[PDB]
Subunit: 176 residues, 2 copies
């Protein structure tokens, strides 16, 4: 199916390439700024999975209690003929009553934007019914993949939601 | 199908985002070095589509007559919560009898690597027969998409091949 391929490609072409070196990038960042407690960037990449497939480019649109703090220093690798293909990732502060309550690397799973766009292009032959069903299947397949993936054990957290996003991220950050 | 989703996501999530600003990046690069004639970087992104799905990270492995020259200055854009997500692309020289015969931005279509890996993972439930059939369908769907795409008219060239790659790229570079 469309979602099956998308979940496998997101893992193979992106998560499996960035997750093994993520915790070293986070450790280097936290150690540089001596971040401890709430200011310490979480050891996991937090992946937003909106079931409605609405993927905005600016997170401080979905919730004002989610504030951009810094870029995580880039990872580079030679990839498919791109010399030093750059992997950029952003650190956000999660606010509660105006103060920093948590810190984490956060981004949306871009294949969910593909499902939304496919439902809008006539040549994709993909309905709004297909979009919602394939969004659920994408999330489930990705969960199944990451459960067994050797690169992705203790450094990734999926956040699926339907329509407070900051409270939800903080719920996850607090558990650990 | 798996290939249908991959071709649409490669277009939606990558080509449609980089192709509108590609020719300005190439123009700025050529103008900086006053590149004219064979040394002028082609106005099109050349996308390698190996039908066997073998995607190496270093192009100077597939053919020695393909030599890395320079990185095209990066494009950045806010994307899915990644502030200034970086789009890196590499310029290659295509050699003929030891001399530079052509110059172009070149890379492999990474979703073809996903098909190869999916055929190797038991949980993907995807055979070697599925890989070859879906590789052909990916190439065909991508060709169909780019034919009508408003962002991708005169700035992209697909190079599908089965097993000289340099001669094939040069065949395309010479036509224009
Ligand atoms: C769905 O397949 C892919 C997703 C994905 C996301 C990638 C990212 O860099 C995440 C941010 C973005 O989509 O720009 S690379 C990649 C490659 C894929 O297949 C080869
Ligand atoms: C197959 O779907 C995608 C492919 C792709 C390739 C991307 C690239 O940056 C090309 C180089 C690479 O794969 O690292 S971004 C991207 C996003 C996709 O879906 C959201």
């Amino acid at each position: 199916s469309v979602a099956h391929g998308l979940a496998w490609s997101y893992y193979i072409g992106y998560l499996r390439l960035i997750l093994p070196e993520l915790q070293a990038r986070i450790r280097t960042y936290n150690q540089h700024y001596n971040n401890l407690l709430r200011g310490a960037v979480s050891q996991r990449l937090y992946i937003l999975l909106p079931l409605d497939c609405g993927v905005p480019d600016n997170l401080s649109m979905a919730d004002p209690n989610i504030r951009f703090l810094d870029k995580l220093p880039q990872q580079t690798a030679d990839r498919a003929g791109i010399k030093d293909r750059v992997y950029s990732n952003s650190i956000y502060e999660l606010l509660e009553n105006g103060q920093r309550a948590g810190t984490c690397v956060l981004e949306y799973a871009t294949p969910l934007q593909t499902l939304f766009a496919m439902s809008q292009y006539s040549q994709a032959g993909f309905s709004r019914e297909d979009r919602l069903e394939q969004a659920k299947l994408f999330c489930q397949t990705l969960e199944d993949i990451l459960a067994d993936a050797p690169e992705s054990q203790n450094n990734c957290r999926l956040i699926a939601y339907q329509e407070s996003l900051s409270q939800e991220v903080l719920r996850h950050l607090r558990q650990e």
